[PDB]
């Protein structure tokens, strides 16, 4: 095993070993960790950066915390670590809107300290293909190809190529029909130069990075699937995702250099 | 008149005035001029650069010269200047193949001096759209969109954007059907932000540059139209060209910054 990625109380501070933020190289967490020891009127408002961590040390949480918002807003984090009553919050790389927050209640002493986190919103385009035809959407894509414009029984590609020493982008698609395979948790291998098959594989195995954040959304019969990549990849990786609506089909090919 | 471009014996050495290479600013010719005064065995072989000039001073040419090749090759120049028996040759910016040459016969004294020019071939991609479906072609395009893949009665764009301080590129298309308008001598104006018409205009007026070289080719029912641009343009210019095959149509939009 050449396990080499970031570590946040994951299984192979330390206690088969957990790792706070066969060769198993441990990378020191690439982001800032914000620790709270348990502000104005028993509540604490905190702005988090994309990927920034927030750890709370509190042994009293009477119900599920940081799983709901303290206003008309749901700030969803993909990693809410619960261990030895030391909850861990990982700020996402994508969010539906700026008007979003999450709440946690820590019963410290005989007072309810409630934490509220907000995002330092940054307008982010998705490097990918929009195969839908609605001009109304909360998502912006680098490429577009309205699948309704393609002929029945035809197959057309929409290519996306990424070429940066270090990456920090969102890759995804918008499909008004069926997505093949279950993108982006599983992607379709690139085409061979020889007469060889192309299989469905997990994206994690193809890119070979840990905690690859995956995001999703839906706006009518339009499905949005996305994923975030932060850092340099070991090798130039390519993969595909198919969108298909009735007799029309279009496929997104993605090539990421390094 | 603010006539401001290159000059090669054109009408408004000097003799309403001709100009060897109302405000009329004369720009000194942006390329090297090669003069022959009239080599091995009464013939001269010369390699020319893209845009380089070659002037022959000879008062005796019994028939049309530099209009035909001295081998299985036709090296076509868009500007063959005939004035005061001082023929001028302007090397093109596009050529079908490397195996190409042109011949001229100068009756100097009592000996036939025959000039032969060849190109310093450089593999050049065309910034534009290939709407055809044949993999066999002598031309390479930056973008492709096989029009046979588009649905009947649908209209899809293929965009090309150029962004360089100084340009030296070929812009064009390959259409398997009808080209609208007569591209690239005349192009279709860009789309208005308001409810205003878009007209057919000459490309020369849109880009505002002199001697914009235009090239063409055909491979079966596939029509290739191209044009060359060398230098910085006064302002960010955009224009369109439509390709249409039966009920299918696709349009190339071109935006050139500066």
């Amino acid at each position, epitope marked *: 095993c050449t396990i080499h990625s970031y570590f946040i109380y994951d299984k192979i501070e330390y206690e088969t070993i957990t790792i706070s933020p066969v060769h198993v190289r441990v990378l020191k967490y690439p982001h800032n960790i914000l620790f709270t020891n348990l502000f104005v009127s028993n509540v604490l408002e905190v702005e988090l950066n994309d990927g920034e961590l927030f750890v709370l040390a509190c042994e009293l949480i009477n119900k599920k915390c940081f799983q709901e918002g303290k206003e008309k807003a749901l700030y969803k984090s993909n990693k809410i670590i619960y261990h030895k009553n030391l909850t861990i919050f990982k700020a996402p790389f994508y969010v539906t809107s700026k008007d979003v927050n999450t709440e946690c209640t820590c019963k410290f002493k005989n007072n309810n300290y409630k934490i509220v986190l907000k995002p330092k919103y940054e307008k982010k385009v998705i490097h990918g293909c929009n195969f839908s035809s609605n001009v109304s959407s909360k998502h912006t894509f680098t490429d577009s190809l309205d699948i309704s414009l393609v002929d029945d029984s035809a*197959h057309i590609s929409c290519n996306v190529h990424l070429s940066e020493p270090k990456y920090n982008h969102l890759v995804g698609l918008n499909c008004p029909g*069926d997505i093949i395979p279950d993108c982006f948790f599983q992607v379709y291998q690139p085409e061979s130069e020889e007469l060889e098959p192309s299989n*469905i594989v997990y994206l994690d195995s193809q890119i070979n990075i840990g905690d690859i954040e995956y995001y999703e959304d839906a706006e009518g019969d339009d499905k949005i699937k996305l994923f975030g990549i932060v850092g340099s990849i070991p090798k130039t990786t390519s993969f595909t995702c198919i969108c298909k609506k009735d007799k029309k*089909s279009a*496929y997104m090919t993605v090539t990421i250099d390094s | 008149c603010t006539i401001h471009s290159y000059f090669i014996y054109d009408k408004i050495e000097y003799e309403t005035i001709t100009i060897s290479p109302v405000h009329v600013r004369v720009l000194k010719y942006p390329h090297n001029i090669l003069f022959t005064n009239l080599f091995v065995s009464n013939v001269l072989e010369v390699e020319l650069n893209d845009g380089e000039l070659f002037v022959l001073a000879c008062e005796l040419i019994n028939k049309k010269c530099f209009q035909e090749g001295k081998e299985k090759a036709l090296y076509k120049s868009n500007k063959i200047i005939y004035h005061k028996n001082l023929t001028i040759f302007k090397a093109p910016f596009y050529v079908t193949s490397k195996d190409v040459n042109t011949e001229c016969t100068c009756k100097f004294k009592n000996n036939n001096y025959k000039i032969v020019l060849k190109p310093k071939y450089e593999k050049k991609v065309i910034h534009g759209c290939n709407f055809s479906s044949n993999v066999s072609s002598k031309h390479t395009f930056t973008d492709s969109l*096989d029009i*046979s893949l588009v649905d009947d009665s649908a209209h899809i764009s293929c965009n090309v954007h150029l962004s360089e301080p100084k340009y030296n590129h070929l812009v064009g298309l390959n259409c398997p059907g009808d080209i609208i308008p007569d591209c690239f001598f005349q192009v279709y104006q860009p789309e208005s932000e308001e409810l205003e018409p878009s007209n057919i205009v000459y490309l020369d007026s849109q880009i505002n540059i002199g001697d914009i070289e235009y090239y063409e080719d055909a491979e079966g029912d596939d029509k290739i139209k191209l044009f060359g641009i060398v230098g910085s343009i006064p302002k960010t210019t955009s224009f369109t060209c439509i390709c249409k095959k039966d009920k299918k149509s696709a349009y190339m939009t071109v935006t050139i910054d500066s």
Partner: single-chain antibody, 239 residues
Framework: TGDVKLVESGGGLVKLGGSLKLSCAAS????????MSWVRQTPEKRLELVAA????????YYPDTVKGRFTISRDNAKNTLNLQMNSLKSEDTALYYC?????????????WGQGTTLTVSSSSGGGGSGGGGQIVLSQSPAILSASPGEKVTMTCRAS?????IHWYQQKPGSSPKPWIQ???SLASGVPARFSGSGSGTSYSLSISRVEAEDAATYYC?????????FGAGTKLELK
């Protein structure tokens, strides 16, 4: 011109050991953008890949049962597909379909021609001289006799892991037709009562309420490693 069309020509009767050339005329699509295959159907109704060629025609594949006897070729300028068949055996007696796949459709055989018959000529029937050094597909049951309005399920088991299965439906007198693409994505026009599911070595096709229209042979197909293989088929019956 028009919609996708594949016309197979040649075929008839050849003595054992003889030679024969088959041809396929493709029209209604950009032929050079598709992978082409010759897929035969034995008298036992087994489907077998005979040969495949890539888009440009530079890469070919032949299963060991035909390797060294058959030769696949394409002429992208003429829109034709050819198969030169040498040293013909009794095993080669089959209806030869010309069919297409695209890398972008997960190599799904979305169009098949009507087929050209070859009769090379003691008795036989079963198996198909295949099943060796390949992922084999085991379909169950062979005959599913169900009553209308019943929920039915047919299984497709694979000798070893396959990352997806394609389903095809065939009614007598016509070639196979796309039914379920990449395990669970129904083909165009396929009723909502149909569903497809699975992973690893176990896959299935289910019908929520069976009707007279569903009566057909359903084949599963895998392409996770060479050669590409199909199962034997589950004949759906409503007597």
């Amino acid at each position: 011109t028009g919609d996708v069309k594949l016309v197979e020509s040649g075929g008839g009767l050849v003595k054992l050991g003889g030679s024969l050339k088959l041809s396929c005329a493709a029209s209604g699509f950009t032929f050079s953008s598709y992978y082409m295959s010759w897929v035969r159907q034995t008298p036992e109704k087994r489907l077998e890949l005979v040969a495949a060629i890539n888009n440009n025609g530079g890469s070919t594949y032949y299963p060991d049962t035909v390797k060294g006897r058959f030769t696949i070729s394409r002429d992208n300028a003429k829109n034709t597909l050819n198969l030169q068949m040498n040293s013909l055996k009794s095993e080669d007696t089959a209806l030869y379909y010309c069919t297409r796949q695209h890398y972008g459709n997960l190599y799904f055989f979305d169009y098949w021609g009507q087929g050209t018959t070859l009769t090379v000529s003691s008795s036989s029937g079963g198996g198909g001289s295949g099943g060796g050094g390949q992922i084999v597909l085991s379909q169950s049951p062979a005959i599913l006799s169900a009553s209308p309005g019943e929920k039915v399920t047919m299984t497709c088991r694979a000798s070893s892991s396959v990352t997806y299965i394609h389903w095809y439906q065939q009614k007598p007198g016509s070639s196979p037709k796309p039914w379920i693409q990449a395990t669970s994505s129904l083909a165009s026009g396929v009723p909502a009562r149909f569903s497809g599911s699975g992973s690893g070595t176990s896959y299935s096709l289910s019908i929520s309420r069976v009707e007279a229209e569903d009566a057909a042979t359903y084949y599963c197909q895998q392409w996770s490693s060479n050669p590409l293989t199909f199962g034997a088929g589950t004949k759906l019956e409503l007597k």
